[PDB]
Write an enzyme that holds these catalytic residues in place. Sequence first.
Site, short mmCIF file in Angstrom:
data_model
loop_
_atom_site.label_atom_id
_atom_site.label_comp_id
_atom_site.label_asym_id
_atom_site.label_seq_id
_atom_site.Cartn_x
_atom_site.Cartn_y
_atom_site.Cartn_z
N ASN A 196 -1.23 16.48 -1.10
CA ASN A 196 -0.87 17.34 -2.22
C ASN A 196 -2.08 17.95 -2.91
OD1 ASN A 196 -1.53 14.76 -3.26
ND2 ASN A 196 -0.23 15.07 -5.07
N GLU A 219 -9.08 4.89 -10.06
CA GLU A 219 -10.05 5.95 -9.77
C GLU A 219 -10.50 6.58 -11.08
OE1 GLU A 219 -8.12 8.46 -6.86
OE2 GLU A 219 -9.10 7.37 -5.21
N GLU A 232 -3.83 4.21 -4.50
CA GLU A 232 -3.21 5.11 -5.47
C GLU A 232 -1.88 5.57 -4.88
OE1 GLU A 232 -4.23 5.98 -8.48
OE2 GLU A 232 -6.26 5.16 -8.53
N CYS A 236 1.90 12.80 -7.96
CA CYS A 236 2.31 11.41 -7.96
C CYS A 236 2.73 10.95 -9.34
CB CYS A 236 1.11 10.61 -7.44
SG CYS A 236 0.97 10.87 -5.69
#
Lengths: 489, 489, 489, 489
Positions: free
Chosen positions: D152, D463, D251, D285
């Site tokens: 994405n 992250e 993630e 997400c």
Amino acid sequence: ARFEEQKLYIGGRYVEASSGATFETINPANGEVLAKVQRASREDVERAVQSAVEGQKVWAAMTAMQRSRILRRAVDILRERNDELAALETLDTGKPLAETRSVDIVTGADVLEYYAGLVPAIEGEQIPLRETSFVYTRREPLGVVAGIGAWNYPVQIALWKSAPALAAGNAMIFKPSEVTPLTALKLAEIYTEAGVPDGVFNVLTGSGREVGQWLTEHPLIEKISFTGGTSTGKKVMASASSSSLKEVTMELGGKSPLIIFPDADLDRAADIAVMANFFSSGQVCTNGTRVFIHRSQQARFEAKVLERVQRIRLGDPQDENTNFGPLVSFPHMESVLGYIESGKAQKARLLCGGERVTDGAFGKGAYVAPTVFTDCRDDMTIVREEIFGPVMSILVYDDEDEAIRRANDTEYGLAAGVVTQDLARAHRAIHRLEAGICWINTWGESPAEMPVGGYKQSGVGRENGLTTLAHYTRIKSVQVELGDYASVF
Amino acid sequence: ARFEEQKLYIGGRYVEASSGATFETINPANGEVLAKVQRASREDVERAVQSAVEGQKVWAAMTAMQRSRILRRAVDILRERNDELAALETLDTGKPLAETRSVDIVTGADVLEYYAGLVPAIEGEQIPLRETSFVYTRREPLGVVAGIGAWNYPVQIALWKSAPALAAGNAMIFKPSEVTPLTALKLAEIYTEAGVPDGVFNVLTGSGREVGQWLTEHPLIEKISFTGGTSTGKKVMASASSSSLKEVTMELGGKSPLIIFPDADLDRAADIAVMANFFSSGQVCTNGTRVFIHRSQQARFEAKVLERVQRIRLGDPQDENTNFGPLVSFPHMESVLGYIESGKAQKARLLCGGERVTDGAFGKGAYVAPTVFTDCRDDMTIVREEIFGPVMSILVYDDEDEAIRRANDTEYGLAAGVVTQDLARAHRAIHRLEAGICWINTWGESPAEMPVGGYKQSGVGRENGLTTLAHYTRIKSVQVELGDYASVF
Amino acid sequence: ARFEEQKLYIGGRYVEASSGATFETINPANGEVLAKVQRASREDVERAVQSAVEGQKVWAAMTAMQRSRILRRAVDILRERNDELAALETLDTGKPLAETRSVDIVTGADVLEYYAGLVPAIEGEQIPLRETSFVYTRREPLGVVAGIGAWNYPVQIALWKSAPALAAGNAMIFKPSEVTPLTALKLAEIYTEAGVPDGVFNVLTGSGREVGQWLTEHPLIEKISFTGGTSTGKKVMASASSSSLKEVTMELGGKSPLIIFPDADLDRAADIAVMANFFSSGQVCTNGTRVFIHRSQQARFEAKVLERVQRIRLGDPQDENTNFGPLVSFPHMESVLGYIESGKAQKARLLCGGERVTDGAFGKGAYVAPTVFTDCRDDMTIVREEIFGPVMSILVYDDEDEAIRRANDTEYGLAAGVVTQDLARAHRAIHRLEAGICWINTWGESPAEMPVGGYKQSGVGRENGLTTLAHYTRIKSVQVELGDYASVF
Amino acid sequence: ARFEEQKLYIGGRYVEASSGATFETINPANGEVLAKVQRASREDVERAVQSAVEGQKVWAAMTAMQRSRILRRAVDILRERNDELAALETLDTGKPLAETRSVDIVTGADVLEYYAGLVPAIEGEQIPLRETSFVYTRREPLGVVAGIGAWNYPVQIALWKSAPALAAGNAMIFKPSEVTPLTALKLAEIYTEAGVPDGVFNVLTGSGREVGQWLTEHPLIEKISFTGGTSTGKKVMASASSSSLKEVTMELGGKSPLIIFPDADLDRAADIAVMANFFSSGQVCTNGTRVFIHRSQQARFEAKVLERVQRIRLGDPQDENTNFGPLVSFPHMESVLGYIESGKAQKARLLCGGERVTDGAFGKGAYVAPTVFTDCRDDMTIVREEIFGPVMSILVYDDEDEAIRRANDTEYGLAAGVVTQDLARAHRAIHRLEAGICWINTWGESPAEMPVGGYKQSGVGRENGLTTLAHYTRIKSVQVELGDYASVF
Ligand SMILES: [K+]
Ligand SMILES: [K+]
Ligand SMILES: [K+]
Ligand SMILES: [K+]
Ligand SMILES: [K+]
Ligand SMILES: [K+]
Ligand SMILES: [K+]
Ligand SMILES: [K+]
Ligand SMILES: [K+]
Ligand SMILES: [K+]
Ligand SMILES: [K+]
Ligand SMILES: [K+]
């Protein structure tokens, strides 16, 4: 004069002072007048303060990364103009081109580059108290701060103070030493070109008794950072305190000890001792001017020092081959020669040097020969007092505990070092030495990451490292009550 | 006198002073002489310093956890003796037993407990430079430090200063206020009982101009921490600076603003304003003495304040039912009444109190009625100057930006607070207020975790929180060279 | 049996399991049945999880200092019960009383004490973005976590896992080894006595393959901490991941090298080598089972190792004079003897030991003589594989780079150590060794402050030190937008 | 095909794969074959690993500031080539130029810039134990790590993984999604051009079940960072664990709740909800795909959502005026439509969209209209499962506690947000939401300073922020014993 008249730097440009007075900056190698320099008046200080107040608001309103990028652009310009700025620093200070081209701008920019990358990392804390309340802290800029520089590393000191001040979102008004005003004005030009807002780095020239004191007295300045002598530092810190309770950083004088243990590599030890005494012609605050040698190694060590000192290339600091220049000024030379005469009068043994060098062109400059005294005693004036010139004092000791006690027997506490190959002895000795800057098997390196400053009468606060960035902010604690409030009334 | 003559505490016991002089401590509730108290001589100061030097070595030689256990034991004793110590503090200060049993020792011991747990967490940094060299830092004790206390929270302030000092491995010489010397001596006994080495917490009694000054001037003391008035703080900090360039923490005066925004619940706002002005009879440095209310809500707000102030239970601080005692002393009451008359003379509208309370036994004590002025103006003496008594100044405003601008227009910067239910307004306003201690929808809570101290002329450094423990250590940087050393010579 | 039947500990008390199944725990010194112990059913795991969920809420709802005081109380009880728990650990493990009385509970409680003091120091960060927006983080508890213990240091491991878990505000379900269940149940009683809320520390007994696996698979458990073999660790970590993506800590096996450089005092080197191989009869994960000696020192070193190995006092762990007990079990002994036989078959030179000790009463226990092989080669089974028994492998090397390369030539990476008097070599060598736990001139000490864990296949994550407390929280970032919100739509 | 065959990037240049196989990458706007792309073989994986091993040594041997300057140069190149890279990303992903030009490279480069400035700030700790011993920690590179990217945000994810990995001194082998392989190869060229040593950033193309698995199983790779679905992440994390106990960052997916409280401005709430659902065509997400609205405000909120959705500008992603593009691929479109059909069948009320757009040229692309369901219930498939497409579900609630409980009732825990003007409620509600990324009165901003990642089954590790840099290092603890060593033997 070699250069045009140097004016005040306020608000992103040069402006005329309003004192009606100037002073001269002189090249210590030959007595040449480099420039006439304006003296800031009391009204000029007020003008620079108001400019800094307004400029700081523009600077603090940018994002952290916008500030970072601007400081990084200043670094790029500094790297580009390294040799040009080095040549200027050599004219103003007398330090060899070999030093200024490799140390002054390199390491000053290293610190600016370091802090530039840390701007986005300045964070507060968050502390939960209970379900209905929590605290967060903010590390806010102090606002306007002042830096007062010394004459030995003019642009380096300007960078070491201005970098964390600006990285932390402050504006700084900087007053370079009357002895060495030139490179500070160049730095101000560079910050402006880099994109630092008008007012954020202003430079006022003049004396300490006047301009320095007006800055330390000003009610709107929130912090003073001073580098110079301890006796002067006390006065500056007192004025900063009694006037408006300013936060302070003081980087002052020293009489730092170097202890050479019997199991040292003696050649390394002699390299260290000469570097710790004669770099920048002995005009470094952290110099290891009390050198402790075991009785068993005194003769061997003296021979090694003598060999190295005899090959020092004293000369024209514009010659690439020169590694030892004149002192910064004729009055400073007079002071150093006074200490040398004191050493002779108190019956220290003169090993090397001990007088002014006047041969040919040198008589036009302020040249003092690298000087070594040995058979020194702890009560001698040259052992007790900072000379800030090229004068090494070698002291004999017999046991490790004795050396450490004698090393610590001073009001100073800037630096200290040991030379030994033993793992245990190196760390145990260094842990017992009362100084802020401690070197094992080396001397003089001061990485941007390493906080440096003095114990005892050698300083207050630190420069460099993460801790210094935090100290150019002030802590605001915010308690957020989400629940009920109970009054006893 | 109620108690026997009070002696100096040096080296884990009481010793006789050498001044041949005493002063009295007076119960401000009834004028009774509580005790004769010895004045320390200059020689007693020297005696306390030498004791501290030796004791600090013992203390620092222990492991971190050994120090932590000892400090935790002191906490246990303080909890066990909370009520007895509170009884004593009430006699010495005149503060209500309902306050001293719940706040003074409770929050003092809370801070000691906090730091006791953090002794093993004091850490330095390690920074690799290259394969052949790295730096590590040590956070070493300063050695001997000195604390100078205030009279409003005697044992609490003793604990807030001594806790981080001892936890960081220092020895502290403590000088309590001449007005309130009794509880500091009890704390000294408790520390000894807990296992604190002789010399680590010494207590010297006497005046600020004598004993306080001798401590600030002593060249072996490395740090001064002082709590008191701003004008006094300036002299103290300057003395500490001029003498030997000591590190300093200053917790000083304030004229802290409380802004009530129009969306605020006025019952909460009134509760906060009253708590922020009359707790400990207004003798709290962080008190919200300038109260800003919007023009539309002045009347309703004044009504809620008067309602609450009327039911304040002034009386004998020995009575559990009392929530408002006399001031700490008659001279202080004289100072406070002076400001109140200034308020009247300058056309401030008197809403509540404004008189000495003299009925019955109250005439034998130093009672000033809870006082509220309204219709105040920024130029009024009661608005500009710290009163340090039960005097609230209510100021009307028209818009948010004006309120914040006026809140910031002072040389002080200790605390600040806002009352609003709006998320955006709460944080935005607080971020613009220039104070070190900021409260949203509350006032007066000072958790051990939260660093507290002043902006501007309200302070230097902080107390409580992690950062304060850090500031009772000094940084030593150690560079370890594992490779070759290059000399230019 | 020696003790009554041991039940599950759930919800602040002992409860009956619902499995209808039990196991016996045996004293490895003599085969005595110590106790029948219940096995948790799948239903009981569910019961423990629900208990922990509810208990964790109560625990997290307390203030930080309230949790601190409770953990400090548990420390007090552990110090009080030290001898009693040591006696129990000695019965369950076969380790000498000399060891269990001085190491197991002492160092276990040391870590709990450490973290108890740190509870109030757990903080998040605050990051300003712009005038109209800022971020704060919260370090929130994970919730319910599980710890799976090993049999070599049963209660110390229970403490090293539960202490940071509880300090960070979690509830932990702990599954001790089926071999050594007794002391974990006592720890649960102690936590309850100290005031830990019901459900916060629950203990389930039974096998790794059943109970351990059901915990690792349970979807409400947020983190697994496991100590044990590398082979098993991979399976545990894989199960924790594939079931519900749990966070993990793994403390696993090793084949840690000890490099003795030729300038080492050989008495000290031999003392370190023997301590690194034979403490707890060689059943320590961090043991230095590959001992590198320079060719020039091989003969003298072997003589000094032999001297010490000969005076090792193998015997009844009940006898205070024993410093070397039986292994934990007969099957474990058979494994170790298999490795010893492989050593002989592969032509390693046997220096000491190498067989079971069966004389008299020793035949009733699993006693293996302290064993030393020398003239070993890197491809031998005993050099490549973890034995987890009292078997030292001595390996000759010729140069420093060779020793370090061979030291690093393993899939393991738990510990490493060097013995040298040279400052530069000590740090240089250690920086090159690929292990998480590195010792210079010592072995085996594991301070509460020092993070410990494995590189490579020896571990994931760490235990002890500040970092470990952090890893028992989860970060939540909260962005507060105070200004406008712009959409592209 | 539009472009030439894409090759592997290993060792600072393109190299031929050894599989003999290729796959196509398709432009989802029109179905055009953009390029054939080589599949990496198992031997190509081995080649990349060996390349990374050698490259990492060169990278780690530089100074911190040397690495910083190289990463900063890469940032400068990314800024220069922003539009060029954006256009390629648009071709490969279908995302509008308006998005790719402003977000993808801008924010990817923002994180690289952030970490570049932090390289010199990576420090270990120093802990004194006693006079004769101390500990320092080192934060060493892991070595070779691997990143597996999602489709994405292809280049942004490549930057968010590689930036902290490189900044911490590691080499990374990166495997972009098979769906979007193009921009990762361009990033590799850029790193090389900036001065990143050969092998430090290698790119391997191919499938997840093959190339991704070969990377996750490789014994020389020390850490895997994966971005993708939760179901896939479990298998990736399990393979990394069972093979060699790798460190991991995951993630993963989400079903994030947005709670709109009834004091919220509905226009702002609607802007947030639309941005939280339809940016990048719903392929984010962290999307707020479960939108909670109070029963009494449902009608009004639906109308404001419908108002904004009706004007969403779906179209050709190469048209600058387009703000909503096709989905990433035809198979992904088919998955999304399957969810939409489930919503209809389960009788959620369809408010907007709910069909593929096939009018004109849209028929050649993978366009799904922005879709909004309301009257949803917690047990519906569209409410339970992540759709990863433009599908908003609106849920009515009655009270705050209920909304929060329902918001938390999911196996996911990636993000969460609340909309309210009330100070207390904003912080109270957000503290109770079980998600790692929390927004107040905003949605979607992910500053470089802010750690982001999932609670529960939405992730492991984080992250961005300071914490992430720390997790690309491994801790080595070094204890230095300066004193005697005592053995029990
Ligand atoms: K000059
Ligand atoms: K140098
Ligand atoms: K000082
Ligand atoms: K009194
Ligand atoms: K309170
Ligand atoms: K100040
Ligand atoms: K057993
Ligand atoms: K020990
Ligand atoms: K690992
Ligand atoms: K594609
Ligand atoms: K944006
Ligand atoms: K997780």
